[PDB]
Amino acid sequence: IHWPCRLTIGSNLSIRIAAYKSILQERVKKTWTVVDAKTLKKEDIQKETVYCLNDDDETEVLKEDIIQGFRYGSDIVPFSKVDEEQMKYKSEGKCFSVLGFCKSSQVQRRFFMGNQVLKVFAARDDEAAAVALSSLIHALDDLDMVAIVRYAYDKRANPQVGVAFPHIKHNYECLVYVQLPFMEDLRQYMFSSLKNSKKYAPTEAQLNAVDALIDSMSLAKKDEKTDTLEDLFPTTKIPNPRFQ
DNA sequence: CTAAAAACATTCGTTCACGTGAGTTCCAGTACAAGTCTAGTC
């Protein structure tokens, strides 16, 4: 299916766009139902959840008598669902706005977040939006730039910051969007250097052996006088064995 | 006949509940060492 929205570069410029999920992990659509061993029916087994206090009597409390709460460092602060909904962050949903433009070298693949990749094309049938999107894509490609944008599926969806970069092919062109991390989503860890360690420094013979191993295990071959690498093990085209 | 208002069907995102493997650390449990064993006279 297509997700329609309006790419915004300012306050008076908007381009109708449609986004599809180019890449998304595929799961099993069918689940497993618990059934009784003696008789293979799910209606003979009932699953229920109960709530009890911290007393030896195991006093039972109804669901309606339960309040949501959060921990505040050894102190419990009650926070009802209605209060949270009233005070939760609110934003205008269904937005695709361009926060800015930055050099592609400033965005690194290792920082990509999320579990999906979006492909954004022009609207269904209109030459104006197609021309505008093509102009934007070509400008970004020529200038070596990407668009830092704000993405929100709808009102409920939590807004996110992502990077959209051009993707031009001989038959089609589009914008590839991938989510970007927040400041608190980054983990700052320290790792000991390996290039300046006198105990883990490999010798010349070891380096030669590793080079020979790498040469002998190349999954890409050079074609005959055409300068076009050929993949010998294209794992991207292999179906997931779990389904089979 | 006609369009439009209502109802119905689908996909997605978010939330929550449960189950489970892995890493860290805190503590109950165990083991072991050392002291005690009555008070007095002659």
UniProtKB/Swiss-Prot annotation:
> What's the superkingdom here?
Eukaryota
> Where found, per UniProt?
Nucleus; Nucleus, Nucleolus; Chromosome
Positions where N6-acetyllysine occurs in the chain = 21, 88
Annotated Gene Ontology cellular components are: chromosome, telomeric region; cytosol; DNA-dependent protein kinase complex; DNA-dependent protein kinase-DNA ligase 4 complex; extracellular region; Ku70:Ku80 complex; membrane; nonhomologous end joining complex
Q: Give GO MF terms, alphabetically.
A: ATP binding; ATP hydrolysis activity; ATP-dependent activity, acting on DNA; damaged DNA binding; DNA binding; DNA end binding; DNA helicase activity; double-stranded DNA binding
Record carries keyword Cell inner membrane: no
Induction is noted as: In osteoblasts, by FGF2.
Chief subcellular location: nucleus
* Its biological purpose: Single-stranded DNA-dependent ATP-dependent helicase that plays a key role in DNA non-homologous end joining (NHEJ) by recruiting DNA-PK to DNA. Required for double-strand break repair and V(D)J recombination. Also has a role in chromosome translocation. The DNA helicase II complex binds preferentially to fork-like ends of double-stranded DNA in a cell cycle-dependent manner. It works in the 3'-5' direction. During NHEJ, the XRCC5-XRRC6 dimer performs the recognition step: it recognizes and binds to the broken ends of the DNA and protects them from further resection.
Q: Extra notes?
A: Individuals with systemic lupus erythematosus (SLE) and related disorders produce extremely large amounts of autoantibodies to XRCC6 and XRCC5.
- Name of the protein this chain belongs to: X-ray repair cross-complementing protein 5
Q: Specify the species.
A: Homo sapiens (Human)
What stretch of the parent protein is included here?
245 to 488 of 732
